Amino acid sequence: QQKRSVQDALEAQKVHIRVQQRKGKKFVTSVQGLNQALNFRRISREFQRRWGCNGTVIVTPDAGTVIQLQGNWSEEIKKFLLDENMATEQNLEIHSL
Amino acid sequence: SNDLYALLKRITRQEVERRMIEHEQLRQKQQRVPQVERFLDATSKTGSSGSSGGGGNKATEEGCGYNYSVMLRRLFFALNRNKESSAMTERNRLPEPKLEKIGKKKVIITNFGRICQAFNRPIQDVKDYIEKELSVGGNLDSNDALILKYEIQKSTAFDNILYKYLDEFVKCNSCHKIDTTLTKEGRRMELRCNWCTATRTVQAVGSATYSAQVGKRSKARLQAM
Amino acid sequence: QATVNIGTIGHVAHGKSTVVKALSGVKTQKYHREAVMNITIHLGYANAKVFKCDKCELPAAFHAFPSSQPDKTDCPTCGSPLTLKRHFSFVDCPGHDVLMATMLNGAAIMDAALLLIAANEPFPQPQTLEHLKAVEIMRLANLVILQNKIDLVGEVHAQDQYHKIRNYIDSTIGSNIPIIPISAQLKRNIDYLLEYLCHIPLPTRQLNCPAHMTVVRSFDINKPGEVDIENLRGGVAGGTVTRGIIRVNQVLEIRPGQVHAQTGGTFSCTPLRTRALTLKAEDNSLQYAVPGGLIAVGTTLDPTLTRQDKMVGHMIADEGSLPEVYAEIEVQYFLFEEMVGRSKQRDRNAKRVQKLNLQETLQINVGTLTAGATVVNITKNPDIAKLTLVTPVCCTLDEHIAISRLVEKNFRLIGWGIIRR
Amino acid sequence: QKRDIVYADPQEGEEYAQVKKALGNLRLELQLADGSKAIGSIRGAMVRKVWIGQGDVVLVSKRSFNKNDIVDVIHRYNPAEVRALVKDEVIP
Amino acid sequence: EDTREPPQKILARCMQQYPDESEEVMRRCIELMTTYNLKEKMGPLLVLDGIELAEKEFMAGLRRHSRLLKRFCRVTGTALLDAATDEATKSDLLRREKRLQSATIEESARICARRFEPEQMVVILFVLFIEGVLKSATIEEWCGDEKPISKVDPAVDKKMKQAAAPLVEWLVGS
Amino acid sequence: LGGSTNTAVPLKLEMWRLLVAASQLREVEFAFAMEDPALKDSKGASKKKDSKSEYKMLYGFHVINQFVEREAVKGNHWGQLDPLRKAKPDMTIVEARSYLRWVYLSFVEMHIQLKLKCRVVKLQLENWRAERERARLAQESPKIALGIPLFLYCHHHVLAVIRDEGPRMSSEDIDTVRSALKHFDLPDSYYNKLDQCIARWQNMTLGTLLPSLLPQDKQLFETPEMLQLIHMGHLLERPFVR
Amino acid sequence: NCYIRDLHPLSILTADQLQRGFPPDISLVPSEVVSLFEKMHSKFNEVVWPNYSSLQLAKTLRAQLMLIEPSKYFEAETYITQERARQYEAEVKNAF
Numbered sequence A: 001q002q003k004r005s006v007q008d009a010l011e012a013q014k015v016h017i018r019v020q021q022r023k024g025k026k027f028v029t030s031v032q033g034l035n036q037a038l039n040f041r042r043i044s045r046e047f048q049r050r051w052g053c054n055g056t057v058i059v060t061p062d063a064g065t066v067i068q069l070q071g072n073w074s075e076e077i078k079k080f081l082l083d084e085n086m087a088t089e090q091n092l093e094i095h096s097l
Numbered sequence B: 001s002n003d004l005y006a007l008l009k010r011i012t013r014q015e016v017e018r019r020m021i022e023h024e025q026l027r028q029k030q031q032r033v034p035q036v037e038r039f040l041d042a043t044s045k046t047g048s049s050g051s052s053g054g055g056g057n058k059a060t061e062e063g064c065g066y067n068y069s070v071m072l073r074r075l076f077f078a079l080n081r082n083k084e085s086s087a088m089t090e091r092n093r094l095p096e097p098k099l100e101k102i103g104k105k106k107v108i109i110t111n112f113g114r115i116c117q118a119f120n121r122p123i124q125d126v127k128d129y130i131e132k133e134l135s136v137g138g139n140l141d142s143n144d145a146l147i148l149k150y151e152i153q154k155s156t157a158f159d160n161i162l163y164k165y166l167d168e169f170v171k172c173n174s175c176h177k178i179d180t181t182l183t184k185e186g187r188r189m190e191l192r193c194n195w196c197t198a199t200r201t202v203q204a205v206g207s208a209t210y211s212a213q214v215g216k217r218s219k220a221r222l223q224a225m
Numbered sequence C: 001q002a003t004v005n006i007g008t009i010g011h012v013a014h015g016k017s018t019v020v021k022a023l024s025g026v027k028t029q030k031y032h033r034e035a036v037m038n039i040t041i042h043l044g045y046a047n048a049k050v051f052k053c054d055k056c057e058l059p060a061a062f063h064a065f066p067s068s069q070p071d072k073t074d075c076p077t078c079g080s081p082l083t084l085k086r087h088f089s090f091v092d093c094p095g096h097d098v099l100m101a102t103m104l105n106g107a108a109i110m111d112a113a114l115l116l117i118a119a120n121e122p123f124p125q126p127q128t129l130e131h132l133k134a135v136e137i138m139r140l141a142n143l144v145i146l147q148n149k150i151d152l153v154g155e156v157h158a159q160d161q162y163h164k165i166r167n168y169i170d171s172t173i174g175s176n177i178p179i180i181p182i183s184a185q186l187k188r189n190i191d192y193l194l195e196y197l198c199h200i201p202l203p204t205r206q207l208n209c210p211a212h213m214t215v216v217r218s219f220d221i222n223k224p225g226e227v228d229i230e231n232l233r234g235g236v237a238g239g240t241v242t243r244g245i246i247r248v249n250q251v252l253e254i255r256p257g258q259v260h261a262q263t264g265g266t267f268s269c270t271p272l273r274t275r276a277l278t279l280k281a282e283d284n285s286l287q288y289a290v291p292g293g294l295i296a297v298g299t300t301l302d303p304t305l306t307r308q309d310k311m312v313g314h315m316i317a318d319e320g321s322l323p324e325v326y327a328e329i330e331v332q333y334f335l336f337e338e339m340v341g342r343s344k345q346r347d348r349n350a351k352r353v354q355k356l357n358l359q360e361t362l363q364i365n366v367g368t369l370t371a372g373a374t375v376v377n378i379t380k381n382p383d384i385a386k387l388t389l390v391t392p393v394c395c396t397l398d399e400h401i402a403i404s405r406l407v408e409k410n411f412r413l414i415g416w417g418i419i420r421r
Numbered sequence D: 001q002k003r004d005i006v007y008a009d010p011q012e013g014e015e016y017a018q019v020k021k022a023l024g025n026l027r028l029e030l031q032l033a034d035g036s037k038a039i040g041s042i043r044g045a046m047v048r049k050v051w052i053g054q055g056d057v058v059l060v061s062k063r064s065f066n067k068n069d070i071v072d073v074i075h076r077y078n079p080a081e082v083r084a085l086v087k088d089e090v091i092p
Numbered sequence E: 001e002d003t004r005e006p007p008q009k010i011l012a013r014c015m016q017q018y019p020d021e022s023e024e025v026m027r028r029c030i031e032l033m034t035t036y037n038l039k040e041k042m043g044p045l046l047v048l049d050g051i052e053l054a055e056k057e058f059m060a061g062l063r064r065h066s067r068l069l070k071r072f073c074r075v076t077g078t079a080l081l082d083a084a085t086d087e088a089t090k091s092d093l094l095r096r097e098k099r100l101q102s103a104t105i106e107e108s109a110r111i112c113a114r115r116f117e118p119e120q121m122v123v124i125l126f127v128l129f130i131e132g133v134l135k136s137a138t139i140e141e142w143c144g145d146e147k148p149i150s151k152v153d154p155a156v157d158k159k160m161k162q163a164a165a166p167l168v169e170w171l172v173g174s
Numbered sequence F: 001l002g003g004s005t006n007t008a009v010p011l012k013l014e015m016w017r018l019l020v021a022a023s024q025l026r027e028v029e030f031a032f033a034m035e036d037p038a039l040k041d042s043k044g045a046s047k048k049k050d051s052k053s054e055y056k057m058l059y060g061f062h063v064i065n066q067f068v069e070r071e072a073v074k075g076n077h078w079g080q081l082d083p084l085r086k087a088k089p090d091m092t093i094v095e096a097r098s099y100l101r102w103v104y105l106s107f108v109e110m111h112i113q114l115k116l117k118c119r120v121v122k123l124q125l126e127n128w129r130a131e132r133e134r135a136r137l138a139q140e141s142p143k144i145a146l147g148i149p150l151f152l153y154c155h156h157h158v159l160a161v162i163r164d165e166g167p168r169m170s171s172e173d174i175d176t177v178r179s180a181l182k183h184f185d186l187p188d189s190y191y192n193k194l195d196q197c198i199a200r201w202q203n204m205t206l207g208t209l210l211p212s213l214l215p216q217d218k219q220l221f222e223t224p225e226m227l228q229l230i231h232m233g234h235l236l237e238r239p240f241v242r
Numbered sequence G: 001n002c003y004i005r006d007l008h009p010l011s012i013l014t015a016d017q018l019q020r021g022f023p024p025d026i027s028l029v030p031s032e033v034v035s036l037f038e039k040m041h042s043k044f045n046e047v048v049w050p051n052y053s054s055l056q057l058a059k060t061l062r063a064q065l066m067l068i069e070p071s072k073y074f075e076a077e078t079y080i081t082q083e084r085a086r087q088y089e090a091e092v093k094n095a096f
């Protein structure tokens, strides 16, 4: 009840996005902070098909179920998680630009 | 003016007629009623001492508090006759960072030292935040011109980075204004305002979650031999 | 000790604990509070004594700190000795969305509150309004409306604001409550404020009826004590008294007591008999507790739980005095028309409340309780629901209930009820 | 040589505006410093003699015969002059 | 319904007695009905209604309970203007003035049906418009009068005609 | 504050004013102005018919529902000053429909610019108040220089009405008269007469309009500025014939 | 610095004012005519005046002067002076 509600609506769940550059004008992008329950294969395979990209479903020690993409995308990696209960609009880090 | 009676057809017709002459009687009658009604409310005449002084609370509500606050707010001499004209919305002036493209890889930022001074934060700490976001190396040292391995087409668009730093760390969310000064309170607790002294805490970056991989290899393994 | 309990309401980012900080000089923490930043989360308490400054009404300038003003035994503002009038406690009831239910928990304790609005936002937010309707369940008469920030923006926008607010009030709740400027991280215009609090009268209470206490705090064990007698420096039932005189070395019953699991489908709960070790209020120690004020009644027996407050909505009385424990409460409910706490565009554009129906998650905020309920019956008589509570509630009055429902990962007042029982 | 800076004439088309993102087939997406959203183009004397990047500020023209067709980039302001312009009194 | 008939009576009686003592303040009442909705709500339906205030005293007691009937009968009431949006808040208000003024003419002929004379309906309606209780259209106060009641049905087709010609005849300025 | 948006609007207002015989309507041709009043008249009719007491912008393709009031309410004519003044008298004949439309659109113009002007008045106002307060300190609060624009604008604004319907009185008329009352206190009977005049001009929709809600004094510097000693005695820009 | 100084009536000699009265230039307001009018009004009444509560030369002139001023008083519905201004001007200069 209320307890869980709070413990969830005000704690944990913090959603990282980042952008970097491979070279010249080539770029890369990641996402982290998404819950284990969700199938990563289904989100990654969406992003891809909606624009020439390239995903992954990488699992890294103590940071795992972290997925990256090819190209600079920051805007749409925020936009798509806003309407979709994936980011309480409060946990949205951008490290781009 | 206006009578009240047990009206009947004939008497109804009187009222009808009286109105038809001029509509002033009814109009101005109910202009006069709210005048003395509202006087009686605000200055109070209500029964029982606690509600009488309740409408006396109301009486001293009427600008009286705000009046004493006029002379007060003028007497501080820091809400009045200053650089608030523009410093209000933060319209403050910040040195416009200025760049160089050396080697078509690196970007040297000459104005680094001057900039860091202006919002009154030290050297190494400011540098950290910048370099973390962009996820590059480079250092400072030198003649206090920064170096970065990040490559961009030469622009004024470095500003976005600075904006993030300034709206997290230095800029209070009370007034919008930087005169601010960092403190050490408890563990991971810092920051103070001093132009109205509404204290605010903030926390400092220590990233280390995910960075990906980029991007040559062979060399990496070779060095990590 | 404190004689009169003064709460604080207002949406977050308009000040709450800020006004309290001005007067008391103390702040509240729990560690977690820092990590989320400017969320208060649980409840405030502090104490500041009233002593009349005798040439003060509204003098031009003095020190920002309130020690020249009341909470001192000597006056430098009139330059003469002070004389007692009153003493107050403070309580801070949250203004954040999620924290509705814990505002409710602390809403039946108080004997008045300060509404806080600020000039830096729009007219009436949603959360403000929702606070007000919450009050009207427990039916406080005294209320005071304030503008926290008036010196951070101009002396133009101030006036307008005041006119609008002024219109709106005494068209909702009479008494024509005053609307007042203050500052309280610049800590000015207390003198003004204080003068209005002085005039708020003594309430009446009963001091010779069987004991009744409402608990909202627990845990004070250690760290340190560490060496010697070893641990700890047993616990408390830290809360307010409404009836009777809680003296030292009396025998107390906790009437929800220790909760025991279901044995198949029917649960049972057994009272806990406990003794008063000491009465502690403020930094002083009492020998008897008078109704009103937060008294830390020292409890005894066993360990486990009651870590920060697992005494949520618990009632303490004397031995042989039992407020009747009910697992099922027959609630006669009345709903509001507007789902307050909704944020869309403007408060006045709100969505309308949906009817109460079978099989839905409720809540039920019986006073200081936060018991989970499911509607099993809408039928017994029209507009009566026989609601089964998992966590038992003790009746001492007919009980005035606020009903909260989940709207979207958070409950938002929907109506009020009274128990027929 | 000559001036590197010109000012808009409010008549005969010509109004300041800023690039947003870039689009294929020589066209780009363009937005007005008073009005609503727009789509621009470019002239053939700037087809790869001049590169107009995103968030660069420029000077349009507008069609004489029919408004609300499409508009076109007839000049570019070097970054040196943008800061100066924006300062003085002129554009947001 | 609720098996709790009584407070609906005490509603009425507290709107007799609060006027009796002091006619000066009538403010509280605004929070009185908020607690006590158990019947079918509405403002002037339950504030014109009383005990002996609304029966025997009705005629003169109308103009001796004035202020609170200008707080409920005339408008629901707000001061709002915006140089931003304020188009849809137009009809939001207007619908609630529409419903209000109209069905207070139901309440008029439901008090004049325990105080039966066709004429004494006419009386009251003018003593509304004379004060600040109403000041809006006499269209409302004629067309509405014929016949809004079915809560008391059987005054219908006589009281109809007598609702009055002088209403219409002052309306058009004739 | 600010105050950039405020300048950005007159650009727009200059455009829309000139778009209107850029192209939207031409509909039918004038054809010489049959008369000026006829506009007002059949606006009166069309607005009465389907009323929210607003009409204008909403459901923007009411251009149809002339057809209603044409084929029904078909005559011999209702509001028949038109046919009389014409010869041939057209009634349901197509020309008449065109006329009606041309009224409706040419009025939507007037209204939709009026809105913007009201906003302008508000933004003129607020910065002049904030100015004044700062100089209250002096307690003689000057100056007459910066608020002559406010006043002169409210003149311009107001006298856009001979042609116009009553706009929404709530925001609009109030926001005008209180920049001439609440924030410019002045002698009364200038006030009283002026508000009578505004009712006259307005009417063809509504007379009254008593704008009596919240006059307030923190402002009283005037008389040594008087009422026509800020006209004769301080104007440089000062209306001209056209 | 400055220095840019204004000017006004000027020289017009009492015989040039007599004969030519008023020869152009004329006016430019703000404040210009209004000042002059203030002067005339006060100076006329201010003489006390020691004869001339008769002969009817007085009451003629005084009345005529009083009739000038209602232009200054009652002209403007809003903040407008229509061109009705310079009729006020032509008045005061013909008077003087």
Ligand SMILES: Nc1nc2c(ncn2[C@@H]2O[C@H](COP(=O)(O)OP(=O)(O)NP(=O)(O)O)[C@@H](O)[C@H]2O)c(=O)[nH]1
Pocket (backbone or CB within 6 Å): B174, B175, B196, B197, B198, B199, B200, C010, C011, C012, C013, C014, C015, C016, C017, C018, C019, C038, C039, C040, C041, C094, C095, C096, C147, C148, C149, C150, C152, C182, C183, C184, C185, C186
């Ligand atoms: N300038 C100024 N700052 C103020 C004023 N009132 C409060 N503040 C600032 O606002 C901040 C918030 O204080 P706080 O009381 O925690 O806000 P809150 O509304 O109580 N938090 P919560 O909503 O969770 O209860 C404080 O840092 C204080 O400095 C005021 O009147 N003026």
Ligand SMILES: [Mg+2]
Pocket (backbone or CB within 6 Å): C016, C017, C018, C038, C039, C040
């Ligand atoms: Mg707080």
Ligand SMILES: [Zn+2]
Pocket (backbone or CB within 6 Å): B172, B174, B175, B176, B177, B193, B194, B195, B196, B197, B198
């Ligand atoms: Zn500050």
